[PDB]
Amino acid sequence: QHCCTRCGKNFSSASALQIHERTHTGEKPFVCNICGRAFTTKGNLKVHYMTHGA
DNA sequence: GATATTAATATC
């Protein structure tokens, strides 16, 4: 029953609405300790993290 | 919240 303010998207988790707000604003709180790439979700940062590790 | 999934994008 969560909704969004900048656009009209309903969300499931409240954390989901928070990350999607980050999708509007540009807050990418997860910093790659190797390269400087920053990410919205921790999972996306782990995704990228796999890249240099191999 | 973590993870998996799809669509979109950068790299070649």
Place this chain on the structure above:
DNA sequence: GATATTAATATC
């Protein structure tokens, strides 16, 4: 065109 990466989001 193929492939790797990313961005956003459904699913658990």
